[PDB]
Amino acid sequence: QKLFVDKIREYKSKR
Amino acid sequence: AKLVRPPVQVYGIEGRYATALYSAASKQNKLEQVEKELLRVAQILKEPKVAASVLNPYVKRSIKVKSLNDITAKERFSPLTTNLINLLAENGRLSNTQGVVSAFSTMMSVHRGEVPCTVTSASPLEEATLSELKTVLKSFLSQGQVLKLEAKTDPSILGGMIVRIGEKYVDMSVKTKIQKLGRAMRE
Amino acid sequence: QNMMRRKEQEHMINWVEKHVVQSTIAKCIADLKLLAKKA
Amino acid sequence: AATGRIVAVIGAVVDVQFDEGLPPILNALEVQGRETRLVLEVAQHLGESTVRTIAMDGTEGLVRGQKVLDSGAPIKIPVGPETLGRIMNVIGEPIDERGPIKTKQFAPIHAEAPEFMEMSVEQEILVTGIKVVDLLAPYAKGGKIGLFGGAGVGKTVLIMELINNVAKAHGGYSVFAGVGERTREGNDLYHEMIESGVINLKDATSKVALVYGQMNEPPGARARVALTGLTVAEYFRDQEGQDVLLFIDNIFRFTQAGSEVSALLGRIPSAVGYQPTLATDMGTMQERITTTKKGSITSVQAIYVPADDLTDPAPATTFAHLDATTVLSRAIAELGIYPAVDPLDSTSRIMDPNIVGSEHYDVARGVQKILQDYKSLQDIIAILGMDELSEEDKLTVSRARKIQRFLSQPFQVAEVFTGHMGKLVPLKETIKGFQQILAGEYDHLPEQAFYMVGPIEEAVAKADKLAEEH
Amino acid sequence: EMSSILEERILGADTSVDLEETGRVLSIGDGIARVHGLRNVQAEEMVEFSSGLKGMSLNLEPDNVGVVVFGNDKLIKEGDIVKRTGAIVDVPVGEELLGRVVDALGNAIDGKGPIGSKTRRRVGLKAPGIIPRISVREPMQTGIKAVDSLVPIGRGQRELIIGDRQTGKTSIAIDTIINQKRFNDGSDEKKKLYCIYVAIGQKRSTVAQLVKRLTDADAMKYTIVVSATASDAAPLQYLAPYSGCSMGEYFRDNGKHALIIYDDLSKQAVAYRQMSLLLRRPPGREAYPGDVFYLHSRLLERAAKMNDAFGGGSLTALPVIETQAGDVSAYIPTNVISITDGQIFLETELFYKGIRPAINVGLSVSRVGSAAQTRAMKQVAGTMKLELAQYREVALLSRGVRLTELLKQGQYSPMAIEEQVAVIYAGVRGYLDKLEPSKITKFENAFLSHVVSQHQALLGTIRADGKISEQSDAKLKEIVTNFLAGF
Ligand SMILES: Nc1ncnc2c1ncn2[C@@H]1O[C@H](COP(=O)(O)OP(=O)(O)OP(=O)(O)O)[C@@H](O)[C@H]1O
Ligand SMILES: Nc1ncnc2c1ncn2[C@@H]1O[C@H](COP(=O)(O)OP(=O)(O)O)[C@@H](O)[C@H]1O
Ligand SMILES: [Mg+2]
Ligand SMILES: [Mg+2]
């Protein structure tokens, strides 16, 4: 499930 | 008169002539023979000198196919193949014969049961996982089938791979997954 | 307030996938095996 | 039999490649693998053991390579008395939800026209109860009639009044073929024939068989449903000797459907845009609708006129196939005169003094002469006014306007529009009333005393009412 | 909001990959894409291009597939991949569309998120046969005095609105949509009418203002708007009517009653002519293809009235047609007149002469008509039509002038059937034969306010009974005479 653990890193960055 | 329909259908004048050749050979069981024949005649024509002798529109058709008769009686060619080239010069469809050759090739490569697969990657593939996915690819086809796998590389797909099994198609690329995630995030 | 919220959300979305813009084929082999199971 | 593969699907045109056993032209083929029965009719042989076919239903969901089976015979429909009281579609299947049509024989919808030695000559006037029809263009028992008209001028109302009068008074197994018309109208006709007892849902003594391919059908169905109904009527005429009535509405849709599929069959367009084979298609279809020495078919056909042209190749070509044309007009219907029959454009072959008699013939010719004089005067009448006409000219205009109004008539099927009760004027009342209006016996009545009346007695009564009340 | 992103948009995101069947674009041009491959694609199946566009497999040929592109072919290049969807072209249907503005393919263009539809329906379905139908009986109330009295429209009918440009056709359709509010809010669920407005070739600003007029009158809550405007691809303007018709067939098939407006069908015929001429098909009259009649007739044939064995629902269609210089004998006008069940002729002479709505009563007709009127409206409108015919014959005369001025109506003002009956009664019994004409409208206004402010009981009785009984006859008589003495 590599792209969810892709996305939420970026989401936390945006946080 | 009945005709033998090849397992694949090619279209155009190339397709029609090659379908004729295939249904002629299948009633005498001389298919690979005539492939080596048209292989030979294709390399006959691909040399520039009489390539220009035959694509000249200012020859008389009699002159051009006279030279063709000469060079086809040189290499002890089968009556089937001499007749095909005679017909291509009769109908003036000679310059397109490469295509017909082309067609015939493709045709019998689905006679031998080959399936062309194309794996595009963002990175020049490793050898290990190349044949790894070759073994993976093997399991989709019935027995009697051979993978013609030709993996080119395009570094714009941002990873993953895009594999085309004939017209079947799996897009495991990462760029398209990113596009899908963006669309879902916007809609 | 709601318009500012929507516009901040829009800049956040194009910034997060710019973050992916700046940013391992094990999943590729796994999907290959899955498709092989799909026969 | 033979099995082939679909190789191309373009609209209603499907190319089928057979590996052996090519099917003759006009054969029916069954596409294999569909929920409902899809039939393809062979139209051409393209060579390469490929045929081109026209589909009788929708072609969506068809895939190249799909199996197709050959029937070995053209579209065969069940024919017999068991078709009476039933609705069937272009390929003979019941579309009334009453079970299969268990007839003993099936006929192909493609047949040969009757020969020249089978033609009949007898000409007997058929009285319809309509004034303008029976006076200026009488119909004939066993003759093809044809009702021309633009969009919304009274074609279907007129054909339903004719249905009412003639078909109800008849005893000879009428047949109705709806070709490219409103499905609503088909339902209306079905139920008004159920209530009137002409169609008997139980204890079958029906005397009308319906065949319907309507506006919603693809071009192939709209191009062969006329042939299907024609085949039913041909059975009733030949193999029973009965005196059949055949109503076709609308028959321009047959030509139009041919024109819609003609482009896809790869044929160079003719004039206007129709198929090059317009006239011969119309001839092969229309020469089978005919009276022979074996039986009699009275054929009433509604004929749509595109954009009110009448020189469009389809109406122009239809004209030569009819014995009594009745041409409706929009300019007349905008005056409020119904039926909007054009008196100066409707003809008949029995309009002959040796058939209708010298009285009828002379009255009709005089009516037409006065109406023609009025038409020729109309231009300066509307430029300068009537105040400048001669006194004889004012008299001819007065009688012409009176004849115009008297030609209109309330229709039993038009009470919803006219408010009056439908009148059925017999022939002698028509002749006498028009003779009297011609002679000058009503130069004192107001013109509005003739609008929408029955016989002339009602005109004088209406004049009296107008004079006393107003 | 931050977690409105990781909501499920990431977790539930269709990040699957499947063994798909593909084709490769050979040549894009003229809004048609010749595509190589797609061996198992079906006729009229929807395919999806690489750019996220969509198309319909029109021409299955031996060596290629002709695909009609639903959008701008600028976004398609030779070599693009084309995937199958396995689904013949279909659109989302259901009640989740009410209140939504969508484009011809069912995608929301109102910015309110996705349509939560659970059912999809093909756009090219066949109309019901002969047996499923039943004659039109229930009235479809427009709220316009002229239409509802002289040219009545039933449920399951097809009524053309034909006329020149800027003569009030869209206004008639919009008032017909606004008028159904009094029924959609009531209790009887067999009088609710769900409206659909397909906008073809129109200015997008005009469609936005139309949605505004519907939202201010609170008519959007029961109205679908399908928009294929002037700047959209010709295939989209071609498809929009069938999308709207399937959205309405959903209601027609489930025992409910839909109404659909095609605004207009002339622009759909023009779009189809563009597509046909770009496909090199032979042009007939006015360069239109041979099957433009079929184009409109397979569409207007789906507006039916089912019987009580097939649900008892209906679908009323009000196709709009724009004539040039008042020519009704043109090709496409006569085609649609051949298809529909009547017309409503709007005139430019009447519209310029202040008579609005500019309905030509002598030329407007409704083939069904009487079978779908209330009894009270029938009682008064029969006499009204007789007197109007008398007046147009002699063009009594003062009665005719009075009535024709009584037929004028304002925009966005649909009257209930009871109030129309009251006004027409006050007009047709003579009670303003001696009032000079120019005050009539004024009188009308005042009169109706009176009847709605104080005599609500009479209107309620007319509503319950549907007819204007002898008791209510004398009651309305004394009401109007007392008001006229006061007026
Ligand atoms: N019943 C009416 N009473 C008074 N004015 C009206 C009425 N209907 C329309 N109008 C006015 O005349 C204008 C005509 O606009 P409308 O959209 O209704 O006509 P149209 O036939 O749709 O023309 P178009 O082809 O431009 O869409 C309206 O904007 C309105 O201002
Ligand atoms: N005999 C008639 N009397 C009064 N009105 C008629 C008569 N015939 C036709 N009409 C009117 O003309 C309209 C068109 O009728 P119809 O025949 O159904 O159209 P079409 O030409 O498409 O067949 C009808 O709705 C009707 O109002
Ligand atoms: Mg008709
Ligand atoms: Mg408009």
GROMACS .gro file of N, CA and C in nm, chain D residues 7-11 57-64 87 95-97 151-153 180-188 190-191 212 214-219 222 253 256 259-260 263-264 267 269 272-273 304 306-309 312 330 334 416-417 448, chain E residues 37-44 58-62 64-65 88 122 126-131 133-135 158 281-285 290-291 293-294 297-298 301 310 328-331 334-335 337-341 363 365-368 370 385 393:
model
  357
  248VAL      N    1  -1.819  -0.866  -3.928
  248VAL     CA    2  -1.690  -0.801  -3.953
  248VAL      C    3  -1.699  -0.650  -3.954
  249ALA      N    4  -1.818  -0.591  -3.948
  249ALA     CA    5  -1.833  -0.447  -3.945
  249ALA      C    6  -1.976  -0.414  -3.906
  250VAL      N    7  -1.992  -0.313  -3.821
  250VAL     CA    8  -2.122  -0.267  -3.775
  250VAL      C    9  -2.123  -0.116  -3.789
  251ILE      N   10  -2.208  -0.063  -3.876
  251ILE     CA   11  -2.222   0.080  -3.897
  251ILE      C   12  -2.371   0.110  -3.896
  252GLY      N   13  -2.419   0.164  -3.786
  252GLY     CA   14  -2.561   0.194  -3.776
  252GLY      C   15  -2.642   0.067  -3.786
  298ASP      N   16  -3.344  -0.469  -3.611
  298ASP     CA   17  -3.355  -0.418  -3.476
  298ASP      C   18  -3.229  -0.336  -3.447
  299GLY      N   19  -3.208  -0.305  -3.320
  299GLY     CA   20  -3.090  -0.230  -3.283
  299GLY      C   21  -2.964  -0.314  -3.296
  300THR      N   22  -2.854  -0.248  -3.332
  300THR     CA   23  -2.726  -0.314  -3.347
  300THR      C   24  -2.631  -0.287  -3.232
  301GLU      N   25  -2.672  -0.210  -3.132
  301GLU     CA   26  -2.585  -0.186  -3.017
  301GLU      C   27  -2.553  -0.317  -2.948
  302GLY      N   28  -2.436  -0.322  -2.885
  302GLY     CA   29  -2.391  -0.443  -2.822
  302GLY      C   30  -2.341  -0.549  -2.916
  303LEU      N   31  -2.331  -0.520  -3.046
  303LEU     CA   32  -2.274  -0.616  -3.140
  303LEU      C   33  -2.123  -0.602  -3.143
  304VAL      N   34  -2.054  -0.715  -3.149
  304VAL     CA   35  -1.909  -0.720  -3.145
  304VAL      C   36  -1.859  -0.782  -3.274
  305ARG      N   37  -1.750  -0.730  -3.328
  305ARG     CA   38  -1.689  -0.790  -3.445
  305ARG      C   39  -1.644  -0.931  -3.413
  328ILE      N   40  -5.146  -0.798  -3.318
  328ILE     CA   41  -5.045  -0.704  -3.363
  328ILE      C   42  -4.916  -0.780  -3.380
  336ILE      N   43  -4.665  -0.859  -3.083
  336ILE     CA   44  -4.626  -0.755  -2.990
  336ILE      C   45  -4.748  -0.705  -2.915
  337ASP      N   46  -4.845  -0.794  -2.893
  337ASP     CA   47  -4.963  -0.763  -2.815
  337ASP      C   48  -4.976  -0.847  -2.689
  338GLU      N   49  -4.877  -0.932  -2.659
  338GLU     CA   50  -4.873  -1.009  -2.535
  338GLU      C   51  -4.992  -1.103  -2.523
  392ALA      N   52  -4.705   1.800  -4.290
  392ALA     CA   53  -4.701   1.768  -4.148
  392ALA      C   54  -4.819   1.833  -4.078
  393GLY      N   55  -4.905   1.752  -4.018
  393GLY     CA   56  -5.016   1.804  -3.941
  393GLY      C   57  -5.121   1.876  -4.022
  394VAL      N   58  -5.166   1.817  -4.133
  394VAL     CA   59  -5.272   1.875  -4.213
  394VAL      C   60  -5.399   1.793  -4.213
  421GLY      N   61  -4.363   0.369  -3.953
  421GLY     CA   62  -4.299   0.493  -3.913
  421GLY      C   63  -4.392   0.600  -3.863
  422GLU      N   64  -4.497   0.561  -3.790
  422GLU     CA   65  -4.592   0.654  -3.733
  422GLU      C   66  -4.582   0.653  -3.582
  423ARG      N   67  -4.669   0.730  -3.517
  423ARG     CA   68  -4.664   0.743  -3.372
  423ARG      C   69  -4.714   0.616  -3.306
  424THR      N   70  -4.638   0.566  -3.208
  424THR     CA   71  -4.684   0.450  -3.132
  424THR      C   72  -4.809   0.482  -3.052
  425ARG      N   73  -4.823   0.608  -3.009
  425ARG     CA   74  -4.946   0.652  -2.944
  425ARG      C   75  -5.066   0.629  -3.034
  426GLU      N   76  -5.054   0.665  -3.162
  426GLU     CA   77  -5.165   0.644  -3.255
  426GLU      C   78  -5.194   0.496  -3.272
  427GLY      N   79  -5.091   0.412  -3.270
  427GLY     CA   80  -5.114   0.269  -3.281
  427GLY      C   81  -5.190   0.214  -3.162
  428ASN      N   82  -5.155   0.259  -3.042
  428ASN     CA   83  -5.230   0.220  -2.923
  428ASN      C   84  -5.374   0.269  -2.930
  429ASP      N   85  -5.393   0.393  -2.975
  429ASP     CA   86  -5.528   0.448  -2.989
  429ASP      C   87  -5.611   0.364  -3.085
  431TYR      N   88  -5.561   0.049  -3.177
  431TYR     CA   89  -5.584  -0.082  -3.117
  431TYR      C   90  -5.703  -0.078  -3.022
  432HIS      N   91  -5.707   0.023  -2.935
  432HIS     CA   92  -5.811   0.022  -2.834
  432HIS      C   93  -5.946   0.069  -2.887
  453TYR      N   94  -4.718  -0.325  -3.716
  453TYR     CA   95  -4.668  -0.196  -3.669
  453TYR      C   96  -4.516  -0.195  -3.662
  455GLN      N   97  -4.296   0.147  -3.595
  455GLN     CA   98  -4.326   0.288  -3.574
  455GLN      C   99  -4.199   0.372  -3.576
  456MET      N  100  -4.213   0.500  -3.538
  456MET     CA  101  -4.102   0.594  -3.546
  456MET      C  102  -3.981   0.549  -3.467
  457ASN      N  103  -4.000   0.474  -3.359
  457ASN     CA  104  -3.888   0.437  -3.275
  457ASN      C  105  -3.803   0.325  -3.332
  458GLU      N  106  -3.846   0.263  -3.441
  458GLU     CA  107  -3.775   0.148  -3.493
  458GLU      C  108  -3.656   0.190  -3.579
  459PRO      N  109  -3.553   0.107  -3.587
  459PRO     CA  110  -3.440   0.138  -3.674
  459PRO      C  111  -3.482   0.138  -3.819
  460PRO      N  112  -3.398   0.189  -3.909
  460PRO     CA  113  -3.440   0.200  -4.049
  460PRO      C  114  -3.479   0.069  -4.116
  463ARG      N  115  -3.846  -0.007  -4.027
  463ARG     CA  116  -3.933   0.088  -4.095
  463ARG      C  117  -3.932   0.069  -4.246
  494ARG      N  118  -4.250   0.670  -4.506
  494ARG     CA  119  -4.145   0.626  -4.415
  494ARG      C  120  -4.067   0.510  -4.474
  497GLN      N  121  -3.816   0.680  -4.690
  497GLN     CA  122  -3.723   0.752  -4.605
  497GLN      C  123  -3.625   0.657  -4.537
  500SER      N  124  -3.370   0.554  -4.773
  500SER     CA  125  -3.274   0.662  -4.790
  500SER      C  126  -3.178   0.671  -4.674
  501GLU      N  127  -3.223   0.635  -4.554
  501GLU     CA  128  -3.134   0.639  -4.438
  501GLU      C  129  -3.030   0.529  -4.443
  504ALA      N  130  -2.703   0.538  -4.768
  504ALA     CA  131  -2.569   0.594  -4.755
  504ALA      C  132  -2.470   0.491  -4.703
  505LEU      N  133  -2.513   0.409  -4.607
  505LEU     CA  134  -2.422   0.313  -4.545
  505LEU      C  135  -2.396   0.194  -4.635
  508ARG      N  136  -2.365   0.364  -5.165
  508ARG     CA  137  -2.422   0.397  -5.295
  508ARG      C  138  -2.418   0.547  -5.316
  510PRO      N  139  -2.539   0.902  -5.382
  510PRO     CA  140  -2.673   0.959  -5.365
  510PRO      C  141  -2.727   1.015  -5.495
  513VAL      N  142  -3.167   1.524  -5.455
  513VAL     CA  143  -3.222   1.554  -5.320
  513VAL      C  144  -3.136   1.485  -5.213
  514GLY      N  145  -3.123   1.352  -5.218
  514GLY     CA  146  -3.038   1.285  -5.122
  514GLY      C  147  -3.083   1.142  -5.106
  545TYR      N  148  -4.669   1.111  -4.654
  545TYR     CA  149  -4.612   1.234  -4.602
  545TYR      C  150  -4.542   1.310  -4.714
  547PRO      N  151  -4.256   1.590  -4.762
  547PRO     CA  152  -4.152   1.657  -4.684
  547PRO      C  153  -4.148   1.806  -4.712
  548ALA      N  154  -4.161   1.886  -4.606
  548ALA     CA  155  -4.154   2.031  -4.614
  548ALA      C  156  -4.258   2.088  -4.711
  549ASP      N  157  -4.368   2.016  -4.729
  549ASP     CA  158  -4.477   2.057  -4.817
  549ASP      C  159  -4.426   2.088  -4.958
  550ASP      N  160  -4.362   1.988  -5.019
  550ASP     CA  161  -4.299   2.005  -5.149
  550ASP      C  162  -4.385   1.952  -5.263
  553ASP      N  163  -4.094   1.661  -5.419
  553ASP     CA  164  -3.986   1.581  -5.356
  553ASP      C  165  -3.994   1.444  -5.424
  571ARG      N  166  -5.182   2.280  -4.666
  571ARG     CA  167  -5.167   2.359  -4.545
  571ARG      C  168  -5.233   2.495  -4.557
  575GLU      N  169  -5.516   2.630  -4.296
  575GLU     CA  170  -5.503   2.756  -4.223
  575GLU      C  171  -5.624   2.846  -4.240
  657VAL      N  172  -6.368   1.621  -3.100
  657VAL     CA  173  -6.279   1.683  -3.004
  657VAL      C  174  -6.224   1.816  -3.054
  658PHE      N  175  -6.221   1.836  -3.185
  658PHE     CA  176  -6.169   1.959  -3.244
  658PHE      C  177  -6.277   2.051  -3.297
  689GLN      N  178  -7.096   3.196  -4.418
  689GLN     CA  179  -7.071   3.116  -4.298
  689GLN      C  180  -7.181   3.016  -4.269
  748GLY      N  181  -0.736  -0.126  -3.290
  748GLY     CA  182  -0.746  -0.219  -3.180
  748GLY      C  183  -0.889  -0.234  -3.131
  749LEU      N  184  -0.906  -0.254  -3.001
  749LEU     CA  185  -1.037  -0.272  -2.940
  749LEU      C  186  -1.116  -0.381  -3.012
  750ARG      N  187  -1.058  -0.501  -3.014
  750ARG     CA  188  -1.115  -0.608  -3.094
  750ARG      C  189  -1.252  -0.649  -3.043
  751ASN      N  190  -1.273  -0.648  -2.912
  751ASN     CA  191  -1.397  -0.694  -2.853
  751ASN      C  192  -1.488  -0.580  -2.811
  752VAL      N  193  -1.462  -0.458  -2.858
  752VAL     CA  194  -1.550  -0.347  -2.826
  752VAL      C  195  -1.684  -0.367  -2.895
  753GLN      N  196  -1.790  -0.317  -2.833
  753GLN     CA  197  -1.925  -0.330  -2.885
  753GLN      C  198  -1.966  -0.205  -2.960
  754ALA      N  199  -2.065  -0.221  -3.046
  754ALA     CA  200  -2.124  -0.106  -3.113
  754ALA      C  201  -2.193  -0.017  -3.010
  755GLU      N  202  -2.164   0.112  -3.017
  755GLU     CA  203  -2.221   0.212  -2.926
  755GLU      C  204  -2.177   0.190  -2.781
  769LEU      N  205  -1.880   0.434  -3.265
  769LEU     CA  206  -1.983   0.444  -3.368
  769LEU      C  207  -1.963   0.340  -3.478
  770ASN      N  208  -1.851   0.348  -3.549
  770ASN     CA  209  -1.823   0.264  -3.665
  770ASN      C  210  -1.728   0.152  -3.625
  771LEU      N  211  -1.781   0.032  -3.607
  771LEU     CA  212  -1.696  -0.085  -3.598
  771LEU      C  213  -1.658  -0.126  -3.739
  772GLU      N  214  -1.532  -0.111  -3.774
  772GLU     CA  215  -1.488  -0.145  -3.908
  772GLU      C  216  -1.391  -0.261  -3.899
  773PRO      N  217  -1.359  -0.327  -4.011
  773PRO     CA  218  -1.268  -0.443  -4.001
  773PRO      C  219  -1.132  -0.410  -3.943
  775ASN      N  220  -1.038  -0.083  -3.802
  775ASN     CA  221  -1.031   0.025  -3.705
  775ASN      C  222  -1.170   0.046  -3.647
  776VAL      N  223  -1.177   0.136  -3.549
  776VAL     CA  224  -1.301   0.174  -3.483
  776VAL      C  225  -1.314   0.325  -3.494
  799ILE      N  226  -2.235   0.005  -2.268
  799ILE     CA  227  -2.297   0.087  -2.370
  799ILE      C  228  -2.334   0.221  -2.310
  833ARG      N  229  -2.923   0.346  -2.001
  833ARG     CA  230  -2.869   0.372  -2.134
  833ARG      C  231  -2.937   0.493  -2.197
  837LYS      N  232  -3.492   0.191  -2.631
  837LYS     CA  233  -3.607   0.193  -2.720
  837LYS      C  234  -3.730   0.240  -2.646
  838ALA      N  235  -3.814   0.317  -2.715
  838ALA     CA  236  -3.938   0.365  -2.656
  838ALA      C  237  -4.031   0.248  -2.627
  839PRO      N  238  -4.126   0.265  -2.535
  839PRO     CA  239  -4.220   0.156  -2.506
  839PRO      C  240  -4.305   0.123  -2.627
  840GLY      N  241  -4.348  -0.002  -2.635
  840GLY     CA  242  -4.427  -0.047  -2.747
  840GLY      C  243  -4.569   0.005  -2.744
  841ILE      N  244  -4.660  -0.071  -2.804
  841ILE     CA  245  -4.800  -0.029  -2.813
  841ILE      C  246  -4.878  -0.068  -2.689
  842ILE      N  247  -4.850  -0.185  -2.634
  842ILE     CA  248  -4.924  -0.238  -2.519
  842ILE      C  249  -4.889  -0.164  -2.390
  844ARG      N  250  -4.842   0.134  -2.331
  844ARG     CA  251  -4.893   0.270  -2.325
  844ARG      C  252  -5.041   0.270  -2.290
  845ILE      N  253  -5.092   0.390  -2.260
  845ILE     CA  254  -5.234   0.413  -2.238
  845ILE      C  255  -5.261   0.559  -2.270
  846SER      N  256  -5.386   0.588  -2.305
  846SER     CA  257  -5.418   0.721  -2.355
  846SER      C  258  -5.396   0.826  -2.247
  869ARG      N  259  -4.659   1.501  -2.612
  869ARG     CA  260  -4.548   1.572  -2.672
  869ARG      C  261  -4.605   1.697  -2.737
  992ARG      N  262  -2.116   1.207  -4.478
  992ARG     CA  263  -2.240   1.143  -4.517
  992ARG      C  264  -2.319   1.231  -4.613
  993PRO      N  265  -2.399   1.171  -4.701
  993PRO     CA  266  -2.470   1.249  -4.803
  993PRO      C  267  -2.570   1.344  -4.742
  994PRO      N  268  -2.562   1.473  -4.774
  994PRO     CA  269  -2.657   1.570  -4.721
  994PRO      C  270  -2.783   1.583  -4.805
  995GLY      N  271  -2.897   1.581  -4.737
  995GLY     CA  272  -3.026   1.589  -4.804
  995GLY      C  273  -3.078   1.731  -4.819
  996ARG      N  274  -3.201   1.755  -4.774
  996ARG     CA  275  -3.255   1.891  -4.778
  996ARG      C  276  -3.186   1.977  -4.675
 1001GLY      N  277  -2.997   1.220  -4.397
 1001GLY     CA  278  -3.122   1.153  -4.425
 1001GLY      C  279  -3.197   1.111  -4.301
 1002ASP      N  280  -3.126   1.089  -4.191
 1002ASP     CA  281  -3.184   1.036  -4.068
 1002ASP      C  282  -3.190   1.141  -3.957
 1004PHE      N  283  -3.483   1.297  -3.917
 1004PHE     CA  284  -3.615   1.261  -3.866
 1004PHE      C  285  -3.603   1.151  -3.762
 1005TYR      N  286  -3.529   1.045  -3.794
 1005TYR     CA  287  -3.507   0.939  -3.696
 1005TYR      C  288  -3.442   0.994  -3.570
 1008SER      N  289  -3.719   1.148  -3.378
 1008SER     CA  290  -3.836   1.065  -3.354
 1008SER      C  291  -3.808   0.952  -3.258
 1009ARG      N  292  -3.687   0.897  -3.258
 1009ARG     CA  293  -3.655   0.798  -3.156
 1009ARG      C  294  -3.645   0.861  -3.019
 1012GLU      N  295  -4.029   0.977  -2.907
 1012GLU     CA  296  -4.115   0.861  -2.891
 1012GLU      C  297  -4.106   0.801  -2.752
 1021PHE      N  298  -4.782  -0.118  -1.599
 1021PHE     CA  299  -4.641  -0.085  -1.616
 1021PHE      C  300  -4.598   0.026  -1.522
 1039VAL      N  301  -4.293   2.788  -4.094
 1039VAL     CA  302  -4.321   2.661  -4.028
 1039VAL      C  303  -4.313   2.544  -4.126
 1040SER      N  304  -4.316   2.570  -4.256
 1040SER     CA  305  -4.306   2.466  -4.357
 1040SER      C  306  -4.162   2.431  -4.390
 1041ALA      N  307  -4.070   2.455  -4.297
 1041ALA     CA  308  -3.930   2.421  -4.318
 1041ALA      C  309  -3.912   2.272  -4.295
 1042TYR      N  310  -3.788   2.224  -4.300
 1042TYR     CA  311  -3.764   2.081  -4.293
 1042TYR      C  312  -3.776   2.029  -4.150
 1045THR      N  313  -4.123   2.084  -3.971
 1045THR     CA  314  -4.224   1.988  -4.014
 1045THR      C  315  -4.191   1.847  -3.967
 1046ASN      N  316  -4.063   1.814  -3.955
 1046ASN     CA  317  -4.026   1.686  -3.895
 1046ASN      C  318  -4.082   1.674  -3.754
 1048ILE      N  319  -4.312   1.852  -3.613
 1048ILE     CA  320  -4.458   1.856  -3.614
 1048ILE      C  321  -4.515   1.720  -3.650
 1049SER      N  322  -4.446   1.647  -3.737
 1049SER     CA  323  -4.485   1.511  -3.767
 1049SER      C  324  -4.467   1.419  -3.648
 1050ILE      N  325  -4.374   1.451  -3.559
 1050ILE     CA  326  -4.349   1.362  -3.445
 1050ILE      C  327  -4.440   1.393  -3.327
 1051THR      N  328  -4.461   1.520  -3.294
 1051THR     CA  329  -4.526   1.557  -3.169
 1051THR      C  330  -4.678   1.537  -3.176
 1052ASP      N  331  -4.748   1.583  -3.073
 1052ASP     CA  332  -4.893   1.571  -3.063
 1052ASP      C  333  -4.963   1.706  -3.070
 1074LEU      N  334  -5.362   2.868  -3.479
 1074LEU     CA  335  -5.267   2.768  -3.527
 1074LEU      C  336  -5.220   2.672  -3.420
 1076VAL      N  337  -5.252   2.389  -3.157
 1076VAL     CA  338  -5.343   2.276  -3.149
 1076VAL      C  339  -5.285   2.176  -3.050
 1077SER      N  340  -5.371   2.086  -3.003
 1077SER     CA  341  -5.329   1.979  -2.913
 1077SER      C  342  -5.410   1.856  -2.948
 1078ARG      N  343  -5.350   1.765  -3.025
 1078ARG     CA  344  -5.423   1.649  -3.076
 1078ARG      C  345  -5.493   1.571  -2.966
 1079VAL      N  346  -5.432   1.563  -2.848
 1079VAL     CA  347  -5.499   1.498  -2.735
 1079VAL      C  348  -5.599   1.594  -2.672
 1081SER      N  349  -5.866   1.775  -2.520
 1081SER     CA  350  -5.981   1.767  -2.430
 1081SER      C  351  -5.970   1.653  -2.331
 1096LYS      N  352  -6.323   2.926  -2.634
 1096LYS     CA  353  -6.270   2.891  -2.764
 1096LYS      C  354  -6.372   2.918  -2.874
 1104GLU      N  355  -6.302   3.503  -3.681
 1104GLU     CA  356  -6.376   3.497  -3.807
 1104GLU      C  357  -6.406   3.637  -3.859
   0.00000   0.00000   0.00000
